[PDB]
Amino acid sequence: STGSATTTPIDSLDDAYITPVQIGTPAQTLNLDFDTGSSDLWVFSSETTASEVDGQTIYTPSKSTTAKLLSGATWSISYGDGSSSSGDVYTDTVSVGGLTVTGQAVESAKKVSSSFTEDSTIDGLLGLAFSTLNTVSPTQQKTFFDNAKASLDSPVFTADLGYHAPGTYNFGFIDTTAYTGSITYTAVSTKQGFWEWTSTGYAVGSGTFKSTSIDGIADTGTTLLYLPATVVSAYWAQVSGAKSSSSVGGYVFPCSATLPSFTFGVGSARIVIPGDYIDFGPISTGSSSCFGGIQSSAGIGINIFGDVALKAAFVVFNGATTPTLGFASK
Numbered sequence: 001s002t003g004s005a006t007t008t009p010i011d012s013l014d015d016a017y018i019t020p021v022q023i024g025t026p027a028q029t030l031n032l033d034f035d036t037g038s039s040d041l042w043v044f045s046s047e048t049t050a051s052e053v054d055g056q057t058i059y060t061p062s063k064s065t066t067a068k069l070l071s072g073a074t075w076s077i078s079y080g081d082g083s084s085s086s087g088d089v090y091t092d093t094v095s096v097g098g099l100t101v102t103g104q105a106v107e108s109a110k111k112v113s114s115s116f117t118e119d120s121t122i123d124g125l126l127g128l129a130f131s132t133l134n135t136v137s138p139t140q141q142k143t144f145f146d147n148a149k150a151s152l153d154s155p156v157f158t159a160d161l162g163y164h165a166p167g168t169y170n171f172g173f174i175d176t177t178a179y180t181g182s183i184t185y186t187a188v189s190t191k192q193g194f195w196e197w198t199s200t201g202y203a204v205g206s207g208t209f210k211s212t213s214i215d216g217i218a219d220t221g222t223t224l225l226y227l228p229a230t231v232v233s234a235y236w237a238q239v240s241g242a243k244s245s246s247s248v249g250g251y252v253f254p255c256s257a258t259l260p261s262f263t264f265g266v267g268s269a270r271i272v273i274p275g276d277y278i279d280f281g282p283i284s285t286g287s288s289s290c291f292g293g294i295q296s297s298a299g300i301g302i303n304i305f306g307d308v309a310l311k312a313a314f315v316v317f318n319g320a321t322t323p324t325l326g327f328a329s330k
C-alpha cells in the first residue's frame with residue numbers, strides 16, 4: 001500500500017504545516033501537524049476542556065463505530081517550545097492520503113496548553129519519530145508509520161514541504177518526479193528516539209564550505225533551524241544590523257535586509273536554503289525588526305533541522321531495519 005497527502009502552511013510565514021487525516025467511521029477529518037520530532041498522535045476532542053477549544057475541529061469518539069476506549073491508558077506530553085497536552089486514549093481507524101491503519105492509538109486531549117488553544121488551524125499532532133518516544137502509559141503505543149510499515153510497498157515516508165506553498169507527505173514510495181539530481185542517504189541514530197543524523201558542515205551565502213560535524217534531528221514539527229552558536233553567529237554576521245535580542249528571544253535583523261543563503265552538508269552533497277526562507281517577518285505588526293529563521297540551539301541541548309531546512313529539500317525517512325535519512329535538492 002501507499003498514501004499521499006497534501007500538507008499546507010497554516011499562515012503566510014510557514015509557522016507550521018497541516019495535513020488532513022481521516023479518523024473513525026464515518027470519517028472525521030482533522031487537520032494535524034505531522035511531527036517527525038514526536039511520537040504521539042493526539043487530537044482535540046469532545047473530551048477537551050471546553051474553555052481550551054477555540055475554533056479547532058474535534059474528534060468525537062462516541063460518533064465513531066470503530067472507536068474503542070484503550071482502558072486505563074493516559075498520555076501527557078511537553079514540547080520544546082513549552083506547550084503541552086494530556087488525556088486518555090482510543091483505538092480507531094486512521095487514514096492518511098488513502099493509506100489506512102486499523103487499531104491506531106488516537107490520544108484524545110482532556111487538556112491543552114494556551115498555545116494550542118490560541119492556534120485554531122491545528123486540530124492535533126501526528127508523530128512520526130520512533131515509537132520509543134510515545135508517551136502512552138502504561139502500555140506504550142506505536143506511531144501511524146510504525147503500524148503502517150509492514151503494509152507499505154517500501155518502509156519509507158517522505159516530506160516535501162513547500163516555501164509559502166503546499167507540499168506533500170508520501171507513505172510507502174519515493175516519487176522520483178519530486179526532486180532533482182540524486183538522493184544522498186546518511187546514517188541515523190535512534191538512541192534518543194529521533195531521526196538524528198550528522199551534517200557534514202555549512203556555508204553562508206557564497207562563502208567557502210566549512211567541514212564540521214553537526215549532530216541534529218530532522219524535525220518537521222519545529223518551524224526554525226537551530227544550530228550551534230558559532231554557526232549561527234557566522235550566519236548573522238553577514239547581515240548588516242542583525243543582532244541577538246534577549247528581549248525578543250533570538251536573532252533579529254532589519255526588515256530592509258536581503259538575507260544570504262545557508263548551505264548544509266549531507267555527506268558530500270549540499271542543500272541550499274535560499275535567504276528568503278530565513279525571513280520570519282516583523283517581530284510585531286508594523287515593526288521594522290524581523291525575526292530570523294536560523295537561531296542558536298544553545299540551551300536546547302540538541303540541534304534541530306526544522307522546517308526552514310527541510311523545506312529546501314525532498315527528505316526520505318527510511319524506516320528499514322537500519323533507518324537512514326535521504327536528502328535531495330528540488
Ligand SMILES: OC[C@@H]1CNC[C@H]1c1ccsc1
Binds near residue numbers: 035080082222302
Ligand atoms: O517544539 C516541538 C518540537 C517539535 N518536535 C518535537 C519537539 C522537540 C524538538 C526537540 S526536543 C522536542
Ligand SMILES: OC[C@H]1CNC[C@@H]1c1ccsc1
Binds near residue numbers: 033125
Ligand atoms: O504552541 C503550540 C502550537 C501552536 N502553534 C504551533 C504550536 C506547535 C507546537 C508543537 S507542534 C505545533
